[PDB]
């Protein structure tokens, strides 16, 4: 047992709201270092079939607006990441945000616009987050893009994500992150290690408890 009486009940109300929308469900794991990262990657590589593993290297450009919502583009092509780093390393933030918004979604360009719940578990290093994430897919209709006042905040994140699909409803995401507010020496910046259990489809809280207990056996 991981959740208390009052945490359990509140997670059940987030699970129902998740299936009722572009709203996502993510259980974020705190205090992940390099030995943790590599131990999760090794363990999941052994038990997860090759057709359920997804290896990706990319750059996450996040524009943060005054009302705190994020516009995030994910550039998957290394050629495009390199062309970005060289053309904008000396440019203004207004020039960079106007370009990031100008991009149309390709297979190599993945766009998502957030619109704003958070629960932190007491004695466990986890945090349940539920945020409305609107993807602009381009094979379906795209929603209205946000207004650029010029006072936006940009956060660049070079990521090396390993996506392990466990069941038909859940997905483990262990990522090697290099966060920086500017573009220079980004790929030289020390690495942050992040672990997340993402739900692709809605599930029972007891099934969530089990899947979290599995991950905790490897971390500890």
Care to describe what's here?
The chain has 220 residues and is an alpha+beta fold. It has a single domain, classed as mRNA triphosphatase Cet1-like (mRNA Triphosphatase Cet1, Chain A, Alpha-Beta Barrel). The chain is 30% helix and 34% strand. It has a 10-stranded antiparallel beta sheet with strand order 5-6-1-10-9-8-2-3-4-7. β5 (118-120) and β6 form a beta hairpin. The protein is globular. The two termini are 16 Å apart. Responsible for methylating the 5'-cap structure of mRNAs. It is found in: Virion.
Short description:
By secondary structure, the protein is an alpha+beta fold. Helices cover 30% and strands 34% of the residues.
> How many domains make up the coordinates?
1
CATH topology: mRNA Triphosphatase Cet1, Chain A
**Gross morphology:** globular
Classify the secondary structure makeup into a structural class.
alpha+beta
CATH class category name: Alpha Beta
N-to-C SSE series? HEHEEHHEEEEEEEH
Q: Name the beta content range.
A: 25-35%
- Computed over alpha carbons, the radius of gyration is 18 Å
Give a count of the beta strands, DSSP E runs of length 2 or more. Answer: 10
State the fourth-level CATH superfamily.
mRNA triphosphatase Cet1-like
Number of helices: 5
Strand order of the largest sheet: 5-6-1-10-9-8-2-3-4-7
**Known CATH architecture:** Alpha-Beta Barrel
Major sheet details: 10 strands, antiparallel
Q: Helical residue percent? A: 25-40%
- Whole-Å distance between the termini? 16 Å
PDB class: hydrolase, viral protein
Keywords: Mimivirus, capping, tunnel, triphosphatase, monoclinic, Hydrolase, mRNA capping, mRNA processing, Multifunctional enzyme, Nucleotidyltransferase, S-adenosyl-L-methionine, Transferase, viral protein
Assembly: monomeric
Entry title: Monoclinic Mimivirus Capping Enzyme Triphosphatase.
